[PDB]
Structure 1
Amino acid sequence: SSQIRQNYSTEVEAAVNRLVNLYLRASYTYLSLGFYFDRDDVALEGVCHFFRELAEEKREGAERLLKMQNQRGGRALFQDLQKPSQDEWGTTLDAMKAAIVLEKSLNQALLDLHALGSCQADPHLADFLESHFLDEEVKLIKKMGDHLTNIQRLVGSQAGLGEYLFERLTLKHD
């Protein structure tokens, strides 16, 4: 247990368990966003697929953190997963704004954990976040910003038409 643990502070161990909770909460928020856009009275398949893929990416991030907790000899502790902030998510524009708010809060949590790791002279934690999380988040936040600008340009004065065209011509669908 303590049989392998070396240079791994209790502060980092607890912040990693909190980061796992935040990634699994973000995966749950994306599950709810994906099934909202699969409602027959919303019916934007490309938007459903975009959020369901992010639910899987965030679960994968949590699982990588949990593998790392165990590689360093810390102990995974799970807490309840709070339900998402909304039950209905509005338009694609509202949803994409909520998603970029969620990603910036995950990014800030990564940055905060990097700072704590660097303060405690834990370079394996710092490099783990730099290699597997920080650029994934910057790439994702840039894609969401590019989508938000396109959705915004499409609203104009024909909001239904623009929402359809963005789903059909930007987002991946069957």
Structure 2
Amino acid sequence: TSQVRQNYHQDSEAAINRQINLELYASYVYLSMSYYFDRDDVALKNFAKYFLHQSHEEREHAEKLMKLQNQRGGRIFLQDIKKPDCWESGLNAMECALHLEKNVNQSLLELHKLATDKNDPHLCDFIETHYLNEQVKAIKELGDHVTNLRKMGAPESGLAEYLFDKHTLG
């Protein structure tokens, strides 16, 4: 048993390992989306920059969960990072990102339920302090972006996506 382990259920340790994989998966999805906008036949540099920043943020989220695992005396178990499942347009990518962030949020809420069921207040506070509000903010931002693109006439209006790239993501 780890000399540091205290009040850390094996189920919580396993759930943290699963969450690490999901954060890495999200980083990979955003990496894919970024380079789609870097294609010569899409060419929206600010969409590309936005999604690359989001990819790097997800890698940081994964590293912080890996640090947590070690802080609590758990053992990191890594699995394959699946390739992104399925970008068409700026609007479609924003919609896919909104769906991804809501999926990650659901996983974090399930993790919090488990921590609450196992009476682990440190883990509850960790999730609340570093992940829950970040998710709410990401989801709101992506919703705002989807709304604007739709109102502007995307995805049929290439002018809409061009101007959004310059004015909102620039």
TM-score (norm 1): 0.95
- Counterpart check, 1:85 vs 2:78: no
Question: Match of 1:138, as an amino acid?
Answer: V
- Cα displacement string for residues 112-152 of structure 1 (whole angstroms, at most 9, x for unaligned residues): 00000000000000000000000001011110011011000
5+ residue gaps, structure 2, are none
Query: Which secondary structure does the structure 2 equivalent of 1:121 belong to?
Result: coil
Match of 1:26 in 2: 26
Query: Which secondary structure does the structure 1 equivalent of 2:164 belong to?
Result: helix
5+ residue gaps, structure 1, are none
Q: 2:125 pairs with 124, 127, 131, which one?
A: 127
- What count of residue pairs does the alignment treat as equivalent? 170
Please give the alpha-carbon distance, in whole angstroms, between the structure 2 residues aligned to 1:33 and 1:162.
19
Cα RMSD, aligned residues only: 1.2
Please give the alpha-carbon distance, in whole angstroms, between the structure 2 residues aligned to 1:39 and 1:157.
17
Please give the alpha-carbon distance, in whole angstroms, between the structure 2 residues aligned to 1:125 and 1:2.
17
**Using a 3 Å threshold, how does the CA distance of structure 1 residues 158 and 112 change in structure 2: closer, same or farther?**
closer
Query: Which secondary structure does the structure 1 equivalent of 2:83 belong to?
Result: coil
Please give the alpha-carbon distance, in whole angstroms, between the structure 2 residues aligned to 1:90 and 1:136.
27
Query: Which secondary structure does the structure 2 equivalent of 1:17 belong to?
Result: helix
Question: Match of 1:150, as an amino acid?
Answer: N
Question: Match of 1:128, as an amino acid?
Answer: F
Is the CA contact 2:90–2:155 (under 8 Å) kept in the aligned structure 1? no
Question: Match of 2:151, as an amino acid?
Answer: R
TM-score (norm 2): 0.97
- List structure 1 runs of 4+ shifted beyond 4 angstroms: none
How far is 1:2 from its partner? 1.7
For residues 27-46 of structure 1, what are the structure 2 equivalents within 5 Å? 27-46=27-46
